[PDB]
Amino acid sequence: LELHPPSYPWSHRGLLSSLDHTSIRRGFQVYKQVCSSCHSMDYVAYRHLVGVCYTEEEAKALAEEVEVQDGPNDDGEMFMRPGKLSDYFPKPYPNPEAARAANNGALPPDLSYIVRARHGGEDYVFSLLTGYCEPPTGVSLREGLYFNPYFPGQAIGMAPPIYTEVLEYDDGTPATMSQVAKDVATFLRWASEPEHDHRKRMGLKMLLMMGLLLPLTYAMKRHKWSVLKSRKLAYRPP
Amino acid sequence: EFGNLARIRHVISYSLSPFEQRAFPSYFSKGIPNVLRRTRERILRVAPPFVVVYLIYTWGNQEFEQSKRKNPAMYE
Amino acid sequence: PSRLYSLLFRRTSTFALTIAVGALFFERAFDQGADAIYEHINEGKLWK
């Protein structure tokens, strides 16, 4: 028994509709300033951004903005260096348990594939992040819990992380809770499928090529099968 | 193989060259009538079963929900 | 056109040459045309 998030009119919902890359950039900013404290985008590395919403040198900037340790040194373990374009996003709580502790038993789930891993993810995400409503009568959430009608059980350890104007969008687009939830849902989506755009272009070329090739192959088949389909049989007993 | 497949007699068989005949003779001219002829010939033997399927499907889903529904008298 | 059959379709070799050459250029045209479409459909959303 769970609330089933509704269908939202996403800009990538259509059959050939790509992602809005400004929204992916804003959602990456939302993840960097809010979501990165507990969740780990393990499978997304700074380099990945180049080509989507940040240019090579631009990405380098972001990369240079983090300290990543280099374990093997002549005699030492870690002089975290300026993270590079080859470095993956920095996971908070190096060990899972660490977070468990920090989040009161909860383990923020790595949001790299969250949208893909959650049924109706994009919607779910938006709903969960925006579904922090009032608990009803009779409910008795355990210590360190909050109430979201969507989350399985309606008892997500995650406290509501998006308060209106939680962070300021560099683009200046008003940082309303929603504008922030929609941006981070687009970004997480991108994260779970960096190739969304490239694919849809392949699908458009595939539809054009099949629309060219199916009637022509049908015409060749009907040529080579007309002979028989016109064959007239006659029985002429002597 | 061919030549030893079967024995027929006095069955003449005329035919035409592919390039000599129209590719889609009366394609939609008779195709539609025929497709329609065909469906009415098996529709009564194909659809009926699946119709009932849609029905069981629906009834099943609704019934389940009702089961989940809280019993009014429950707790009251 | 009966020039086609005589120049392109008639000899298998010629029938081929035309296919290969056409295909060589078709890609250029198809990709270009297709890209124009894709982009426009989502003109607003793309890096640039």
């Binding site: - | 005329y14 000599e20 005949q21 | -």
Partner: peptide, 22 residues
């Protein structure tokens, strides 16, 4: 014999100098 009947009509099939094009 073999001349009693003539090749059946294929007019609804047959198309309407042209071979080269065809």
């Amino acid at each position: 014999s073999h001349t009693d009947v003539k090749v059946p009509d294929f007019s609804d099939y047959r198309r309407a100098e042209s071979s080269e094009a065809r």
